Design a binder for this molecule. Sequence first.
Ligand SMILES: C=CCO[C@]1(C(=O)O)C[C@@H](O[C@]2(C(=O)O)C[C@@H](O[C@]3(C(=O)O)C[C@@H](O)[C@@H](O)[C@@H]([C@H](O)CO)O3)[C@@H](O)[C@@H]([C@H](O)CO)O2)[C@@H](O)[C@@H]([C@H](O)CO)O1
Ligand SMILES: [Zn+2]
Lengths: 218, 216
Amino acid sequence: DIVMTQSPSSLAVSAGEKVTMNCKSSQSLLNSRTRKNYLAWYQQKPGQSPKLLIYWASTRESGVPDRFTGSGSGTDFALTISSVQAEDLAVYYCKQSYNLRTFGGGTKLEIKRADAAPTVSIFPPSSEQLTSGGASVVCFLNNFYPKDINVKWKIDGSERANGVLNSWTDQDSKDSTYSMTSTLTLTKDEYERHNSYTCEASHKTSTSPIVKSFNRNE
Amino acid sequence: EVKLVESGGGLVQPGGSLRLACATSGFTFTDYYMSWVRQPPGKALEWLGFIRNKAKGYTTEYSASVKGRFTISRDNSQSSLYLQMNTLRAEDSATYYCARDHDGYYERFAYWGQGTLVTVSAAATTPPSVYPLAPNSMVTLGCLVKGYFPEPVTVTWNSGSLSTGVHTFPAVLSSDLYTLTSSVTVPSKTWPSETVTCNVAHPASSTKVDKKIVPR
Ligand SMILES: C=CCO[C@]1(C(=O)O)C[C@@H](O[C@]2(C(=O)O)C[C@@H](O[C@]3(C(=O)O)C[C@@H](O)[C@@H](O)[C@@H]([C@H](O)CO)O3)[C@@H](O)[C@@H]([C@H](O)CO)O2)[C@@H](O)[C@@H]([C@H](O)CO)O1
Ligand SMILES: [Zn+2]
């Protein structure tokens, strides 16, 4: 038991702003001898392996931008980003190595940016899938902000909720946008019973739904 | 350069055993402590254990969560690190990384593997079906990679030569089968005039698929 905890669990900050995140140990990580705190900070961007930013509390790993600063002592530690950039999107972990090693629970840093409306496209089932007996219809809602979005599927002008699975990507490291996939899966027999296939995207950037549709009469 | 590479990750039955391996180069292996660390999908890093360097005679330490169930060992002649895992349960499903630990000065994991994903489940290996998603300025294409188990799958577009404007959506599990899709956006100049192909790999079934997106 050295218990490590971090806060906040998550936060959003616009580019250029200051970010402070805290790490608390349950007992001191000061080696009274050497006068070094055994505490490191790591950065894990989406889909990547964790990467070292800071060790011994305040010593910045070479290669790491100077906008990152480790600080603190004993049981309390902070990592401060002086001026956040879009690529700083990540989960930041602190890790004590005073007695074996233990990671904190992480702080997930999201980027806030201006609202952006989604680009929608719809795709019919492939002939390969149909001939095997399924029909998946897919909508992409690309490059939007904020993350909250609603899609409704209309088949021959009417709503349908069974068979729809949604999946959002992690925020984009470059433009700070999200994208989401909505997939409606029917059997070939049900797909062949109707004509109009409609994906409607409702996002706060508009009062008017973005609607993409295709008619099965190709 | 320093290179760390995990391998041996995959599907294993609850109650079963698995050993991962971590191949290293670019530094003096016996100088370093080596650690293993895991991350269940969506969750925090957790340190598992380490094996000390030569000076300290390669002793081992474990976190309480795996002590007596996991064993770490190294092959110094080959510059290799291993993790023996036993009596696996669902909580063990995670990406496992090795990382270069203490050398006797610096207190830091300077370097980390890319990770290898372990899935603990009774569900069977199933290869994905892969379907083309075909339709002004920009045009958006896709691939639907449906019905596979376990994770992971990789998707690239034209062998990795299309990189930007790619979104690969996180797979979602339904009825013990995952589905994901990938989208790529390219200027309609480039397509269909110049080909676009998605390359999907599913290492658990050794599946390699290319799907050319052809206009309907
Ligand atoms: C707690 C006793 C410390 O004795 C020290 C001191 O600074 O007072 C530190 C000793 O540290 C070592 C060494 O031989 O350099 C290395 C230690 O490493 C580890 C470990 O193997 O468990 C791992 C490190 O990451 C770190 O977690 C440390 C701890 O923070 C405790 O220091 O432990 C460890 O191997 C100790 C060993 O227990 C000693 O028997 O040795 C060492 O520098 C001694 C010195 O040899 C005599 O004063 O000073
Ligand atoms: Zn119907």
